[PDB]
Symmetry: C3
Subunit: 479 residues, 3 copies
């Protein structure tokens, strides 16, 4: 008779893309994990103050709004919109200040305060009765006005600082506080990692009239003071400077960069745990990549891609007379048969184990390469707050597109590598079988060996374990 | 005798580049189409007003210059340079305003007007006798001056708006119109998709003196008014705001984004039609890509690349004793011979048809991939006007370089895939021939089969159409 | 007997990465050259003035500090820090001015002067006794003040120009020079390749008070004048304009772009020569790429990459019965044996020479492709000064990361191509040997040929040079 070695015939599950062709495979999966329909927040605390506080109220430490100063900060937080009024004075924010305040109120790090340094350098802060509820502000009102100074300080962390002015909308109060003429225009300048500036004038002159018109009015209608704020950026090891004159104001806190909380936009479900969450749902455990449109997430999360890709999970179907496949059912991926089905077909676990190990190792190497590329693209020392703030109002990140293209190319390369490794394993197994069999028989060049004798089911079964011997099968002659 | 199957010998036309090697091929073509030496403008209207109008005159709706308000806008348009004087007042434009006005005067979309809203909100516009020829402007001159306000409106389309001031160069007129003091400095601010601002002062104070010196004088030498203009951007669904004081001016029209006309720079030829045009010539019909240095074009145009690449159009020349080639001439790419030339060599159309179909399908898949990459690079909702305006004075687009590199890699991949598919077709044909022939004969391992009998001229022809039978050829024995 | 042809067995040196697998090779090297521990400055002059001059002193042509006006400019230069005082007036620089002055004081090109044009256009420059030591400045003080003008000039080279004001910190001097009121705010504007502006006011008004506080005091404590400077950029063929008023100042020199000197940061070693230097060490001669984190270098330097990669330098080890390897030692890479070691094994130099040439040619093509990609990424007409100035305070260049990724991919492709070419050479050699031998013998399909006769060592070496003939070996019969 004769024997053959090959793969187990299984239904074709799909098609994957290699470098030079498309291959039909018996099994495939997806590299990235898909978003769920809810947020699994078991074991996590949720902060919600949308009915009592606004974004600005948190920065100024209003009574009952102290998220940036909590000892333990919840990963999920919600609050009122940007235009929510406070109980103190009226406020105005620039566009840059709005963009950065959308983030800085919910940073999960530890914030640094430098109000005591200002107090000891320039004396006690100015006092007004309209800001009794708020606490976190320093008002520079020297005895001799305007009395310009430049305040320099070495920062303790990378972050943002809000500065500006606090002025009345009446001419008498403005003159009493600033000590300038109404027709004059003056500036407050900030020099840190970058440069920022803001201009002020009298209540009936530009641009202060526009500030008055555009300001957000407070809950108390008798309050005349408006606090106008801009933002500046500071680096950890460098020094920053602020040009101060009478009437200038500064919030004496550095809002350090890092992770910041996620505002839930979908249903929050308890009695369900996870480790990677986003504003629109959680992700399955142990994902190599996640299908997300941003880098903002909480918990332990992998890199994000914009779309999913298919990777091989089985083996190529290289079959339609022997054509490499084995009709008989076997418990494995490779087998030895003698055209007898039911008991004369035996499978070898060694080749299947090798193929599974090859798939695992190639996938691990691919994931490592992708992580290295992600680190190169975004940087080793990166923070989500800084990236999101620098993006600004833009919702499209080009680095995500570059990373997605790289991941697609990597997936194609992985499919190619896995297929080639499987081919090498099969060729090595065939060569080993030919070596073990003997030189007497001849090879048909397709994995089937014709023996000089008859090979019963026991002869086939002995070959798979490798204990086959030629002595007991020499009898009789056939071709 | 014996028979052989193989490819038709043809002269080598060139060399293409694959992933792992360079392959010699009998035919190749180019992916992209080349620019022509003229513009084919049959069936298209051409606008030319360079002898009577300038760029600014079109925006202000000067008598005889109304391109942005035409019902049907020609695809080709020419007009005077930016420094062309108008018949109204003198004008001054910022650098950003100049850059955006180079584009906005020839947008092919429909522009939105909001002058009636301004009139009903604030009353009739201010009137001067020096602007009788121009129509498209609103001059905010309230009864009580300065009377600052903030005008907010929800936009109807994404586009640009030109704002600023309209002031005299005499102190008396400036004081009468603005109602301010000459020593004061005031601002006009625009808040839309971004932020813009511009400053004004008295005629003898900075920066108004520089505006007077740098202004473009009008045709009438008795005109004292100067209109100073800056630009701002608005998004479709969002609201925009302008800070207005007495003396401020605004052009009450949103110049919507989209396609804009092309100014011809080469000879215009009628009696010749095309569908893709550029400023330096037209392009051939039905091109997958065009060799262009920008994304600005009119008509139906494909993506543009910076240089051309070669793609395979024939088959690889895998020949220098039989070496895979067939000496005898045949009407196809594949054939069967018996070392007899003239009638005993027969060609099979099936393999040639399969190879041509493979080339076509691979090229189509490549073009689809390139289109997807282009959409990812530039965005699904993109307009030529916005891209060109954001580019500014820069003439080098990095996205074009990235796309060209991607297209080069794609072309290499396509060559590899086509060559592999041709190899697979050839191997399948050889296996089918071996199966059809029979087990009696032996294979030399190079596509040539030695028969046990003689194969005459009719025997070769019988094999080609697949009706070959063994019964009538068993007679006689040879090796 | 029998003969075999194959590769010489050598110890495995390493593993390289190809497109679809990792290959074990007998030799590999690195694409890029590594930085040395010293600067080899034999035959080069070194400039050092850190004990007498500062950066600003060089621009103003202070007595003894004239690097930008030297006939021959040394490639290595050192000077005092930016905050070094001068012997003239006090100075203040904006952040942009500081960033550009860090570079422009050491440009190696020829600088263009236009002071004579200013003198002939507007008369003799204003004179003060506090600037007797400095020479390179023009002070615009007309007879009728303020007397605003706009100065337009066609540039001669691409570069930077420093402009601004020169004012006293006393009210009387400010009024006498400017001719303005103290409460007014005025601007100096620069229009070139981009737009720049700077604002001034009275000594007791913003922002001049901040300039006074932040200024760097001069060596002489009786000097009251402060020169406040900003920077602007000019292109070669275009015209630039400056808005000048009484009291404005401008440095009448265009600091042309190009290469600029390197400040040594490591030990300088003479009696040692090189052609590529950086601030932290030199590089070996004749390197295709250098491991550097920037594009700033002096001498003839190749493109820089951020990390090194391995390229093949030998051949793949395709061996563990004959398995393609030859046990006997030979003087080459390929050989012919008859299982007799010591004298019956002969090597062929043709295949080894072909393999070495293939390696060289593939590496050269790779280097050419990398150079083309570098030129596309950075531009054909580029200068180091412009790139470094546009980078600013950023120390991470993304184009370097893109180039490094491209070089990694290119190295993988080169390994693949070299291995494929070696395989082709081996297959061609085997086919030629089979053709030369004869049809009588049979092939075992593994590079070993069994002859019908015995083959002594003489029969073996006769094959190597190809003068083998069958006539003298027909005698005797064996299998
Ligand atoms: C303070 O800072 C916050 C954080 O920066 C700001 O949050 C952003 O607010 C935006 C305005 O509300 C918001 O934009 C909305 O996003 C919604 C997203 O939900 C969608 O769900 C769909 C399915 O139901 C998806 O189809 C859709 O888009 C997909 O996203 C996938 C990833 O999940 C991608 O793989 C897919 O390709 C697909 O398409 C992407 O869409 C992206 C835009 O969402 C786009 O950038 C990307 O290129 C792909 O094209 C999406 O998942 C939409 O339903 C809304 O219509 C609207 O677009 C941002 O998502 C918020 N960002 C984050 C990180 O939370 C907050 O606004 C700010 N506050 C203020 C006052 O400024
Ligand atoms: C209002 O907006 C308009 C649109 O934004 C502005 O139009 C631009 O005006 C510029 C100044 O007039 C103009 O620059 C000129 O371009 C000419 C182009 O013609 C050349 O023809 C040559 C053959 O005869 C080509 O060799 C040459 O360059 C090639 O272009 C090929 C594509 O066609 C490329 O594949 C090749 O690589 C090759 O090299 C490219 O050159 C590009 C620059 O042209 C460069 O960006 C690219 O990276 C490659 O290096 C070119 O085709 C030149 O002859 C002139 O010397 C000058 O460079 C722009 O082309 C105009 N742009 C468009 C889209 O029309 C208009 O200026 C503005 N008005 C104001 C007042 O600002
Ligand atoms: C006027 O202009 C000058 C030129 O623009 C400015 O010079 C810069 O000054 C900076 C501050 O002094 C200086 O930053 C320092 O750089 C040092 C570099 O020396 C290190 O040596 C180490 C080994 O001993 C390396 O490990 C290290 O980094 C490596 O660099 C390799 C290339 O040589 C890379 O292949 C490696 O990946 C590795 O990591 C890189 O680091 C880079 C930063 O150095 C980073 O950008 C890159 O992405 C890689 O991550 C480095 O070689 C450090 O020791 C110091 O700690 C500090 O970082 C800049 O290097 C100077 N730039 C140049 C071109 O000279 C000058 O500041 C300015 N003056 C003013 C007043 O502004
Ligand atoms: C009916 C009415 O509003 N009449 C006003 C009258 O209120 C106003 O007097 C000012 O009123 C405000 C009301 O909130 C404060 O009470 C002002 O007192 C203080 C304050 O505590 O806010 C005193 C404090 O010492 C001042 N601080 C500094 C640093 O100077 C501030 C400061 O002057 C102002 O807040 C300016 O921003 O004010 C009280 O003076 C008078 C103005 O004299 O005008 C009537 O029409
Ligand atoms: C010889 C000479 O020029 N003498 C001037 C004299 O012209 C000037 O009077 C002004 O002259 C201009 C000439 O174009 C206009 O006629 C001015 O009239 C108007 C106008 O432009 O129609 C009247 C109009 O009601 C005004 N509109 C508004 C909204 O206020 C404008 C406006 O005041 C000015 O255009 C300012 O921009 O002017 C006419 O007053 C006198 C100035 O009184 O000075 C002589 O030297
Ligand atoms: C003790 C003391 O400082 N008393 C000052 C007295 O110095 C000052 O007079 C000015 O002093 C400076 C000292 O460096 C110069 O000597 C001024 O002379 C000149 C100069 O040469 O610098 C004269 C020159 O013609 C002027 N140039 C122009 C273009 O106008 C300049 C110019 O006025 C100033 O430099 C302004 O920047 O000054 C000399 O006038 C007096 C002021 O009158 O004040 C005492 O308190
Ligand atoms: C996914 O990961 C989460 C971790 O966030 C798992 O939740 C933990 O499960 C272990 C084992 O049951 C418990 O001891 C922990 O108390 C759980 N954490 C919390 C916060 O409850 C979760 O089991 C994992 N598997 C899923 C969700 O299928
Ligand atoms: C290229 O495309 C243009 C379309 O712009 C073709 O011109 C049209 O040709 C058809 C068929 O002859 C006519 O019915 C149309 O009237 C033509 N259009 C116009 C505007 O005249 C042109 O024939 C195509 N082929 C070329 C140019 O070779
Ligand atoms: C590396 O290159 C340098 C050139 O910068 C070589 O130095 C020159 O060597 C030649 C030959 O000995 C001399 O004639 C020149 O005078 C040298 N130049 C200088 C400036 O001295 C150097 O020899 C090369 N090889 C090394 C450094 O190993
Ligand atoms: C292999 O052996 C079987 C029976 O022993 C025979 O039918 C078959 O033809 C043989 N294969 C070949 C290629 O001759
Ligand atoms: C492939 O296998 C999966 C099992 O994970 C199955 O859900 C899917 O339907 C299969 N696809 C086909 C085409 O049979
Ligand atoms: C405040 O903002 C919210 C959403 O940003 C908006 O719905 C609301 O109308 C705003 N309130 C006012 C008074 O404009
Ligand atoms: C305001 O200006 C006048 C002169 O214009 C001046 O006398 C007065 O001192 C100025 N006001 C202050 C507070 O200095
Ligand atoms: C094939 O047959 C021809 C003649 O029938 C003969 O000359 C040739 O040697 C044969 N091929 C081989 C490999 O023996
Ligand atoms: C290749 O074929 C084209 C036909 O389109 C011909 O123009 C060209 O000259 C040929 N090239 C060579 C090298 O024969
Ligand atoms: C107007 O501009 C054109 C081209 O931009 C130029 O040739 C002409 O000299 C300019 N006219 C004036 C008066 O500057
Ligand atoms: C100009 O300023 C003076 C005082 O400096 C003031 O009295 C006058 O009202 C101002 N002009 C206007 C139009 O308000
Ligand atoms: C080749 O010849 C040797 C001796 O001549 C013999 O031992 C060996 O078995 C032969 N090879 C084959 C495949 O028969
Ligand atoms: C590879 O060869 C180099 C010789 O250039 C040698 O220095 C190195 O140690 C070798 N590596 C191994 C693993 O033998
Ligand atoms: C000047 O700068 C150097 C380094 O930039 C610094 O060490 C020194 O303290 C500075 N001098 C002063 C007076 O600030
Ligand atoms: C300063 O302003 C006053 C009026 O405010 C004016 O009379 C005087 O001429 C101005 N100074 C100058 C130098 O013009």
């Amino acid at each position: 008779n004769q024997i053959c070695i090959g793969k187990a015939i299984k239904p074709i599950n799909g098609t994957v893309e290699t470098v030079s062709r498309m291959a039909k495979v018996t099994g495939m999966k997806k590299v990235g994990g898909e978003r769920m329909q809810k947020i699994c927040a078991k074991g996590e605390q949720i902060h919600d103050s949308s009915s009592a506080c606004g974004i600005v109220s948190h920065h100024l430490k209003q009574e009952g709004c102290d998220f940036p100063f909590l000892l333990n900060k919840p990963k999920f937080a919600t609050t009122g919109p940007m235009n929510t009024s406070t109980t103190g004075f009226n406020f105005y924010l620039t566009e840059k200040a709005k963009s950065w305040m959308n983030i800085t109120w919910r940073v999960l790090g530890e914030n640094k305060d430098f109000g005591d340094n200002l107090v000891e350098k320039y004396g006690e802060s100015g006092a007004t009765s309209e800001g009794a509820t708020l606490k976190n502000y320093y008002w520079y009102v020297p005895t001799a006005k305007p009395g310009p100074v430049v305040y320099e300080k070495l920062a303790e962390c990378t972050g943002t600082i809000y500065y500006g002015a606090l002025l009345s909308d009446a001419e008498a109060g403005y003159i009493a506080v600033t000590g300038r003429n109404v027709t004059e225009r003056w500036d407050v300048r900030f020099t840190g990692s970058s440069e920022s500036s803001i201009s002020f004038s009298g209540p009936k002159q530009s641009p202060m009239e526009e500030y008055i018109i555009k300001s957000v009015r407070s809950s108390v209608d008798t309050v005349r003071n408006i606090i106008i704020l801009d933002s500046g950026r500071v680096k950890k090891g460098e020094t920053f400077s602020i040009s101060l004159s009478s009437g200038a104001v500064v919030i004496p806190t550095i809002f350090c960069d890092g992770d910041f909380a996620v505002t839930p936009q979908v249903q929050i479900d308890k009695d369900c745990a996870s480790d990677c969450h986003s504003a629109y749902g959680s992700f399955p455990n142990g994902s190599s990549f996640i299908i997300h449109h941003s880098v903002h997430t909480v918990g332990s999360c992998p890199p994000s891609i914009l779309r999913n890709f298919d990777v091989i999970d089985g083996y190529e179907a290289t079959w339609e007379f022997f054509t490499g496949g084995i009709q008989g059912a076997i418990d494995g991926w490779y087998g030895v048969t003698n055209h007898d089905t039911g008991k004369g077909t035996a499978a070898d676990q060694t080749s299947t184990q090798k193929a599974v190990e090859a798939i695992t190792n190639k996938l691990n190497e691919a994931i490592e390469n992708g992580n290295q590329r992600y680190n190169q693209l975004y940087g080793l020392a990166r923070t989500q707050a800084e990236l999101l703030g620098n993006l600004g109002k833009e919702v499209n990140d080009l680095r995500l597109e570059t990373f997605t293209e790289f991941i697609r190319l990597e997936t194609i390369l992985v499919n190619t590598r896995i297929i080639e490794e499987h081919q090498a394993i099969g060729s090595k197994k065939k060569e080993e079988v030919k070596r073990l069999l003997g030189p007497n028989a001849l090879d048909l060049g397709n994995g089937c060996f014709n023996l000089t004798h008859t090979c019963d089911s026991n002869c086939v079964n002995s070959i798979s374990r490798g204990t086959y011997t030629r002595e007991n099968y020499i009898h009789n002659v056939t071709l």
